[PDB]
Amino acid sequence: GQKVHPNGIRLGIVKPWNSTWFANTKEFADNLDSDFKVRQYLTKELAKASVSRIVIERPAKSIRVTIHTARPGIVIGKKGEDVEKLRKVVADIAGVPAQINIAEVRKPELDAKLVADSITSQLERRVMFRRAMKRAVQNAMRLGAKGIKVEVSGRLGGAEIARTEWYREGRVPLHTLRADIDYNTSEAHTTYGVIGVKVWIFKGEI
Amino acid sequence: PRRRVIGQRKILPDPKFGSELLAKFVNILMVDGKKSTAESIVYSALETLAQRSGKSELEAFEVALENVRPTVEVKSRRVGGSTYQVPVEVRPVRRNALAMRWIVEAARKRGDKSMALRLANELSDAAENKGTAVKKREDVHRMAEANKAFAHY
Amino acid sequence: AKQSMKAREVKRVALADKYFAKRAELKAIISDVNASDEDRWNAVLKLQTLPRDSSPSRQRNRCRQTGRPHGFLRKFGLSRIKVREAAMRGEIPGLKKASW
Amino acid sequence: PRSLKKGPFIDLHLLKKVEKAVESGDKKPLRTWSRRSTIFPNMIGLTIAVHNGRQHVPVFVTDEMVGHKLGEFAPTRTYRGHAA
RNA sequence: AGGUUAAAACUCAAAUGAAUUGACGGGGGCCCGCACAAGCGGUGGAGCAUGUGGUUUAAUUCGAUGCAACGCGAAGAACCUUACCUGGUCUUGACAUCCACGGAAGUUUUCAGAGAUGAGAAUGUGCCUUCGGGAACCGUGAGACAGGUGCUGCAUGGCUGUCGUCAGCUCGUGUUGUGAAAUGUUGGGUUAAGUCCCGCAACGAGCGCAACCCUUAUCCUUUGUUGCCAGCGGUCCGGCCGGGAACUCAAAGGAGACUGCCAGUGAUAAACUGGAGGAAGGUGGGGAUGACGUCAAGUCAUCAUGGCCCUUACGACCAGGGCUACACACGUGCUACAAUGGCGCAUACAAAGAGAAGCGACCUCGCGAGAGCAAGCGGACCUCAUAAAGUGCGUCGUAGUCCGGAUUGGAGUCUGCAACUCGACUCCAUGAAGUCGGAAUCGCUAGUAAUCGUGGAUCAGAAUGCCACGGUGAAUACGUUCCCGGGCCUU
Numbered sequence A: 001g002q003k004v005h006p007n008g009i010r011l012g013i014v015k016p017w018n019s020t021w022f023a024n025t026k027e028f029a030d031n032l033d034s035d036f037k038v039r040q041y042l043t044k045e046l047a048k049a050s051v052s053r054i055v056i057e058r059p060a061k062s063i064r065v066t067i068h069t070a071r072p073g074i075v076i077g078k079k080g081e082d083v084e085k086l087r088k089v090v091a092d093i094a095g096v097p098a099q100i101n102i103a104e105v106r107k108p109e110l111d112a113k114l115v116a117d118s119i120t121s122q123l124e125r126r127v128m129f130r131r132a133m134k135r136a137v138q139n140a141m142r143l144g145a146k147g148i149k150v151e152v153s154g155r156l157g158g159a160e161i162a163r164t165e166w167y168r169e170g171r172v173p174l175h176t177l178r179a180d181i182d183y184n185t186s187e188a189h190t191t192y193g194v195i196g197v198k199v200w201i202f203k204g205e206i
Numbered sequence B: 001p002r003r004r005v006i007g008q009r010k011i012l013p014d015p016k017f018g019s020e021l022l023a024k025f026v027n028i029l030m031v032d033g034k035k036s037t038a039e040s041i042v043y044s045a046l047e048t049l050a051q052r053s054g055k056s057e058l059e060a061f062e063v064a065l066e067n068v069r070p071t072v073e074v075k076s077r078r079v080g081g082s083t084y085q086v087p088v089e090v091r092p093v094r095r096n097a098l099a100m101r102w103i104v105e106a107a108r109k110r111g112d113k114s115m116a117l118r119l120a121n122e123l124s125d126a127a128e129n130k131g132t133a134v135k136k137r138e139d140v141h142r143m144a145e146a147n148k149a150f151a152h153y
Numbered sequence C: 001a002k003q004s005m006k007a008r009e010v011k012r013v014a015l016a017d018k019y020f021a022k023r024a025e026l027k028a029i030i031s032d033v034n035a036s037d038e039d040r041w042n043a044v045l046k047l048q049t050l051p052r053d054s055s056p057s058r059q060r061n062r063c064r065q066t067g068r069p070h071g072f073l074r075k076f077g078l079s080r081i082k083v084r085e086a087a088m089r090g091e092i093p094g095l096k097k098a099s100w
Numbered sequence D: 001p002r003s004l005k006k007g008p009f010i011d012l013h014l015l016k017k018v019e020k021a022v023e024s025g026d027k028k029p030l031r032t033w034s035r036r037s038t039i040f041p042n043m044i045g046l047t048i049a050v051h052n053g054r055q056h057v058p059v060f061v062t063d064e065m066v067g068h069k070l071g072e073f074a075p076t077r078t079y080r081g082h083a084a
Numbered sequence E: 001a002g003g004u005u006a007a008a009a010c011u012c013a014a015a016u017g018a019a020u021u022g023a024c025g026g027g028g029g030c031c032c033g034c035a036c037a038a039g040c041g042g043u044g045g046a047g048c049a050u051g052u053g054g055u056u057u058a059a060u061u062c063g064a065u066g067c068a069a070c071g072c073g074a075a076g077a078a079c080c081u082u083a084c085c086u087g088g089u090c091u092u093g094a095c096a097u098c099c100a101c102g103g104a105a106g107u108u109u110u111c112a113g114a115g116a117u118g119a120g121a122a123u124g125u126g127c128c129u130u131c132g133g134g135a136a137c138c139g140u141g142a143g144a145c146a147g148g149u150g151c152u153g154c155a156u157g158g159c160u161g162u163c164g165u166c167a168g169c170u171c172g173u174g175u176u177g178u179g180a181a182a183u184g185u186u187g188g189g190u191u192a193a194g195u196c197c198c199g200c201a202a203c204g205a206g207c208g209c210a211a212c213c214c215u216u217a218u219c220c221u222u223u224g225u226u227g228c229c230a231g232c233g234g235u236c237c238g239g240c241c242g243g244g245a246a247c248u249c250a251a252a253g254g255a256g257a258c259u260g261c262c263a264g265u266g267a268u269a270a271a272c273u274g275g276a277g278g279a280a281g282g283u284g285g286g287g288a289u290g291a292c293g294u295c296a297a298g299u300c301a302u303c304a305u306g307g308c309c310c311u312u313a314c315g316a317c318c319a320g321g322g323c324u325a326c327a328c329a330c331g332u333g334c335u336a337c338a339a340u341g342g343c344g345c346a347u348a349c350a351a352a353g354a355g356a357a358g359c360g361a362c363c364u365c366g367c368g369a370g371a372g373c374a375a376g377c378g379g380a381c382c383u384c385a386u387a388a389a390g391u392g393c394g395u396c397g398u399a400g401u402c403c404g405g406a407u408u409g410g411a412g413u414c415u416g417c418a419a420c421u422c423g424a425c426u427c428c429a430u431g432a433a434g435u436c437g438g439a440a441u442c443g444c445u446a447g448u449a450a451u452c453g454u455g456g457a458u459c460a461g462a463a464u465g466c467c468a469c470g471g472u473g474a475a476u477a478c479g480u481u482c483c484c485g486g487g488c489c490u491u
């Protein structure tokens, strides 16, 4: 059957929120819309920067955006030129003074969003889906995840009949609430249509 | 049920007399959870019965219950072939439950002015071995007697 | 929703904002108990002259990410589907799966 | 119905049309799409062609029609019975 | 009677044997579930609300459509929404980028139309600026393009229903078999549980079970306002005031339940039965949580997307109409048929929640729906906001009624440009069917069913639907032969 979202079910237990601000009903929707626009622009702009997570905070009449990246040098540029440009655009979009922080994602092979994006890029480059998933699982297991599962669904290899294929190593205990499960998805737009990728990575119980 | 894990639920005794028997009677008479209304009806009917007869409310109620209580009923038993109506002995708790239910149903079927009056008339008829729920006990006993030949299934 | 359908809503919001007060004072004149019997008639006739899209009752709440005109939620400004997606992704502060 | 304190409703364009028609001898039908207008005691005698959705049907305004809306005399749905 | 010997034409690409995994059986064995049984209350009958089929229509927009569609997408169709129809209109365009030109953008009015729109008429002409330019925002001009709720859910992603919260589903290595496969996972017990113990050619591991999460039931510590009032002092008797931090309570941190202890049974086991203590006893109650997979199940109309299709039209704007039709059929509900009740008067006891284009008190006016004026409240403070059933007194006295309140006439209120099609509510009058419902059929095992009120999302207005909250408060379960679904072993 259908499964609960692994991040959503853990949002108050072992996982943190991606947006941390307080608002009343008067500006809640406006803040949500501005966050959506900011994340949209940042994701579109930093497509090749290996961005895994965009955290947004609103301390007081200002916006602070933390970008978790595996290529901080590419994100920042020479003496902060690119990050300054992004700060300007984010301030323009949000209508408030903006402050951009860069967080380091060491070991990108252990980050669910980055793994899914890598598999998706390979699929769009017409790499064998089996090879892509096996490589991702092997890399994560070698780096030391307690478990990983990768699932790819759609017209794999351009087949007329779509199907779902998944691989798993170690343990991925989705029913354990206190389990550190990093889960994320991605989509590849191939000439035969859309292929969906889901990645679960287990990092031990807290 | 299959697992046989059902215990028993304690029932508070009735206010005026402290009888769980009468409390169960009130519970059977009650509709829609209107226990105060049921209690008032039962008390009015009991006072009418007590002033009609020479015994106390509890004694008259016990006489009516003794006259309405069945002893053997018929239950269906399906074996290889056809189903038979086997006569079975009734345990005392079920005797009381059936007597109360039949009395309440007969009183509801009656056509007097008030429910308390109907209940009092039904109780007096039961004490004199007349009317409904007494005919019902008689019908049950007649069916058991007619099917007595099957009292080994 | 369609692009034209979204443009209709933005135009309606703009017209309502533009003609806000010019409607409010006319409605006050019409609803005035101690007003005369001909300035009321003139105000009633003038209220119809304004474009219909300037009335706030012509606006339909739509999902701010898709344009869906059904299943709207005011607290988030989104339809139920998008609210669920954002909540699961963790993008709605303080919102989690409830149980009691 | 419409509150008394607000007075009966009438569309301004139709009011102008009937004002221009009553003073003149214009007996041509007054074509309109305004079924929401109340019939006022100033256009009894001339014919108003009210829209019903796909055409304009002419109603001859009489005294007894005062207080009704123009659409009350222009039915919108066509029905003739089932299997009749 | 027939036996025995014994062809051919024509026709098919198989027919067949043994064994393997499933599935099935009106085969066997052992178990489970409101599945029966034991009970209580309903539906099918009536009126009305609502969805659907059909019919009708210019259109009655599209989708769902055994269980698992039918108060479903829709958490709310007068205009809008709207995707449909009629009519009136536009063509790089309602919504984007690029280029050329003219221009600040904006405000205030007139006419025509019915509007879209067209023709005008005035008022401003700002802001960086090396005052070469711009750079917002408008209009016009082309052309790369925009646009599509158009088709394919049988090309797809994502999301969902379902068997089913059922206890199952598998893998590595080893071993058996020519092989499909088998073992493990079977067996003796036991459990809600592939739960656990013992045995055992298996040894281990994973996804499921359980636990970790939320809430409810008890206690402790901290804090004590807007919340509280035990001991005090006053008092207009109103926690009202000075006070108090005890108590209810608010919300943070902790404790507590673990077969922990005792007895018996049991294979010196797992475990079961009972007892003590405790607020709670064996998973304490409720929720969240949905394994491998199944139905080419649902959704191209939330969105995204391969392919196909249209481009002065399947795109775009507007007014009016339709989605509310009506010989009929079905599903889901509401209100009743009355006296355990109706009506009148008086009088108690809740929980949960919402509020700024909002909730709206007091006072006055109105029979009333409401109106005028106008506090307080972004809230433990103010408002919504009187809980109702209940209880006391009186009346009605079994009648189609002082039951029932459908339908219709007249008069109004409020929202809203606008209540004709087609809103809700109020007043006066009117006073239908219906007197407990055929075959058949549904829900429920305890604070449940039944019954009684309250709130919220959607929302200008528009609930008998949906989601949520308390009050009162049952009956019954001997048992697993039978009906339905399911689990394990075997044939």
Ligand SMILES: [K+]
Pocket (backbone or CB within 6 Å): none
């Ligand atoms: K022969």
Ligand SMILES: [K+]
Pocket (backbone or CB within 6 Å): none
């Ligand atoms: K042959």
Ligand SMILES: [K+]
Pocket (backbone or CB within 6 Å): E043, E437
């Ligand atoms: K019925």
Ligand SMILES: [K+]
Pocket (backbone or CB within 6 Å): E068, E297
């Ligand atoms: K279905």
Ligand SMILES: [K+]
Pocket (backbone or CB within 6 Å): none
């Ligand atoms: K699908």
Ligand SMILES: [K+]
Pocket (backbone or CB within 6 Å): E177
């Ligand atoms: K063999």
Ligand SMILES: [K+]
Pocket (backbone or CB within 6 Å): none
């Ligand atoms: K094996």
Ligand SMILES: [K+]
Pocket (backbone or CB within 6 Å): E300
């Ligand atoms: K498509």
Ligand SMILES: [K+]
Pocket (backbone or CB within 6 Å): none
């Ligand atoms: K309409």
Ligand SMILES: [K+]
Pocket (backbone or CB within 6 Å): E049, E050, E333, E334, E464
């Ligand atoms: K209903």
Ligand SMILES: [K+]
Pocket (backbone or CB within 6 Å): none
């Ligand atoms: K019904």
Ligand SMILES: [K+]
Pocket (backbone or CB within 6 Å): none
């Ligand atoms: K009557």
Ligand SMILES: [K+]
Pocket (backbone or CB within 6 Å): E078, E419, E422, E423
């Ligand atoms: K209407």
Ligand SMILES: [K+]
Pocket (backbone or CB within 6 Å): none
């Ligand atoms: K079998």
Ligand SMILES: [Mg+2]
Pocket (backbone or CB within 6 Å): C001, C002, C003
């Ligand atoms: Mg679109």
Ligand SMILES: [Mg+2]
Pocket (backbone or CB within 6 Å): C057, C059, C060
């Ligand atoms: Mg609306």
